[PDB]
Amino acid sequence: CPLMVKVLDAVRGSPAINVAVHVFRKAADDTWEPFASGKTSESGELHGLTTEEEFVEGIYKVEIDTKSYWKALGISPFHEHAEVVFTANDSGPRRYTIAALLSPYSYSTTAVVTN
Amino acid sequence: CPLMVKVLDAVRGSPAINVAVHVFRKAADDTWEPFASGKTSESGELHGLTTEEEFVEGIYKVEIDTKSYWKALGISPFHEHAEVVFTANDSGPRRYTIAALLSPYSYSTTAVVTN
Amino acid sequence: CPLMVKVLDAVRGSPAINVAVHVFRKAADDTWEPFASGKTSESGELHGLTTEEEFVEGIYKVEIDTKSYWKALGISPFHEHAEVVFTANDSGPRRYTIAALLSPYSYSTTAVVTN
Amino acid sequence: CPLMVKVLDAVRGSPAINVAVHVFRKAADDTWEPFASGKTSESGELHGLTTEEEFVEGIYKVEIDTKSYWKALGISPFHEHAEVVFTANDSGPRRYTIAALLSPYSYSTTAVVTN
Ligand SMILES: O=C(O)CCO/N=C/c1cc(Br)cc(Br)c1O
Ligand SMILES: O=C(O)CCO/N=C/c1cc(Br)cc(Br)c1O
């Protein structure tokens, strides 16, 4: 699994479950093309978005739909979504974990990159 | 001043100076139209981007050029940029400060919305 | 002013107002001795804790009473307090700003060290 | 396993490996007594600190030795350590994951608490 997403909720101290995630890849004409999508599980994780073969070099955007998550908990948050944009596999294949820690008016995102 | 940006460097414990910042407004055709831009000051701040008159309700994006910042420091970064996407709302407080705390493989962003 | 504290609330997107903050110095017997304290202002800031004359090199602890802050908002928190422990050094810049970004089950802290 | 620690490095985008962790528990005389200790693994994780039987209600302090970690990478960081202080098991047994994301002049810590 070369691209994984993990989302945590900093208000509740829990995984952020059922968070929609959309992944896009920049095309040769410089526009964002759909690449994969899914929803976080009960553990706040999203696996199985892509394969090593499909996950070629490129610029990828991982959009985490945080606004819908908070609205469903009764909270009107600040951001529309959290966007994570990065070049992938430009020095050969890697495994990426994109993690996000969510609060209504703040989020943090990190990447863990392994061989 | 209704919209300010503050950028900090978590590696050096300092303001992030001379970071390019672009602000976009979402247009009716769903595309991002340039709105304002600048470079952070020696205090890591960018003021004077817009006026109360111009900063009407809508969806805005603040794009912080983090990749060029880390490249100048000789540190290999993960993200192409940091993106902050939000709705400006007239029902809340009048000043929006978008703050970002930068590391090579991580960033945090918060919104401080005050009167 | 060589030591300042700034506290933000990531749930409300606001300064964290009226938060108690205690500063301690490590004594020669390795115990923490009270040094200075106060409550954050309406801007979430606490200034005037010490002077350049008093703020000699040593190990200091800044304890932010986050539990009482969340209790006042009716939100169940995880931590008893946030603790920031550091060595003050005369070889670096002269002003230390200890910033903290608070959520019920998470906090971030950074140091902005400037001239 | 009711108490786990996970540490990430925000500069390198990797687990923080070989980080020393000391856990203390407040005794009836209000002093911190040693409770458990260990080091993070190649995955940045520390398991096996305690058992459900031993991990009774109390106030616990998890001290993550961040300064030694950074010094070994050639970096002189700001903090002496990251301290996480919390009441545990006061509404029955729970499972706690204490996570920390490290940068030289900043860290964030969250808790994931499960039944
Ligand atoms: O395994 C679990 O239950 C959660 C532990 O993983 N933590 C991830 C994580 C932690 C912090 Br602190 C900041 C960011 Br951004 C993260 O993505
Ligand atoms: O006075 C200064 O120099 C700036 C201090 O403000 N801190 C802001 C801030 C702190 C943390 Br922790 C995380 C995020 Br995101 C922030 O935006």
The CATH number of residue A75's host domain is 2.60.40.180
Mutate to test the pocket of ligand 2, among B6, B41, B84 (most ligand atoms within 8 A of CB): B6
**C109 Cα to chain B: minimum distance (Å):** 10
The Å distance, Cα A108 to ligand 1 centre, comes to 10
Do the beta carbons of residue D66 and residue D81 sit within 8 Å? yes
CA pseudo-torsion sign A20, A25, A30, A33: negative
CA distance D13 to chain A (A): 5
> Closest Cα to residue D75, out of D3, D2, D11?
D11
Tokens found for residue A67: 């606004």
C10–A101 CB contact, under 8 Å: no
- List C-alpha distances in Å: A85 to A111, B54, B61, D85, D89: 11, 29, 14, 34, 40
Ligand 1 atom, smallest distance to B108 CA: 15
Is C68 near chain D, with CB under 8 Å? no
Nearest to C86 among D79, D84, D112 (CB): D79
Binary contact (C110, B15; C-beta < 8 A): no
Kindly list the partner chains of chain D, i.e. chains with 3 or more CB atom pairs below 8 Å: A, B, C
How far is A51 from A101, CA to CA, in rounded Å?
A: 25
Q: How far apart are CA A103 and CA C74, in angstroms?
A: 16
Please state the length of chain C. Answer: 115
- DSSP codes of every residue in A25-84: EE-TTSPEEEEEEEE--TTSEE--S--TTT--SEEEEEEE-HHHHHHHTT---SEEEEEE
Q: Which of C10, C111, C113 is closest, CB to CB, to B110?
A: C10
Q: How much distance in Å is there from the Cα of D68 to the middle of ligand 2?
A: 25
| C-alpha torsion angle, residues C34, C39, C40, C46 (rounded to 10) | -40
Report the gap between the CA of D99 and the closest CA in chain C (Å): 9
Q: Using the beta-carbon criterion (under 8 Å), do A108 and B109 form an inter-chain contact? A: yes
Q: Which residue has the tokens 């409770």?
A: D35
B106 touches chain D (CB under 8 A): yes
Q: How many CB atoms lie within 10 A of CB A37?
A: 14
Instruction: Look at residues A45, A36, A37 and name the one whose alpha carbon lies nearest to residue A17.
Output: A45
C-alpha span between C8 and C43 (Å, rounded): 9
Determine whether the interchain pair C106/A78 forms a contact, defined as Cβ–Cβ distance below 8 Å.
Answer: no
Nearest to C110 among B101, B111, B113 (CB): B101
Task: Report which bound ligand comes closest to the CA of D106.
Answer: 2
| Nearest CA-CA partner of B16 in C110, A59, C85, A63 | C110
Angle at B16 between CA B10 and CA B17, to 5 degrees: 160
Q: Which of C7, C19, C84, C110 to mutate to test the pocket of ligand 2 (most atoms within 8 A of CB)?
A: C110
Tell me the structure's resolution in angstroms, rounded to a single decimal. 1.5
* CA-closest candidate to residue A88, choices A53, A39, A52, A55: A55
Q: Which domain holds residue A92?
A: 5-114
Closest residue to A101, CB basis, from D110, D113, D114: D110
End-to-end Cα distance, chain A: 12
- And the tokens for A98? 């994109």
Domain tally for chain D?
1
Are B112 and C15 an interchain contact pair (Cβ–Cβ within 8 Å)? yes
D72 burial level (CB within 10 Å; 0-12, 13-18, 19+): exposed
Which distant-in-sequence residues (6+ apart) come within 8 Å of D17 by Cβ? D40, D41, D42, D43, D44
**Interchain contact A14–D (C-beta under 8 A):** yes
Q: Which ligand is nearest to the CA of B110?
A: 2
Cβ atoms of C109 and C10 closer than 8 Å: no
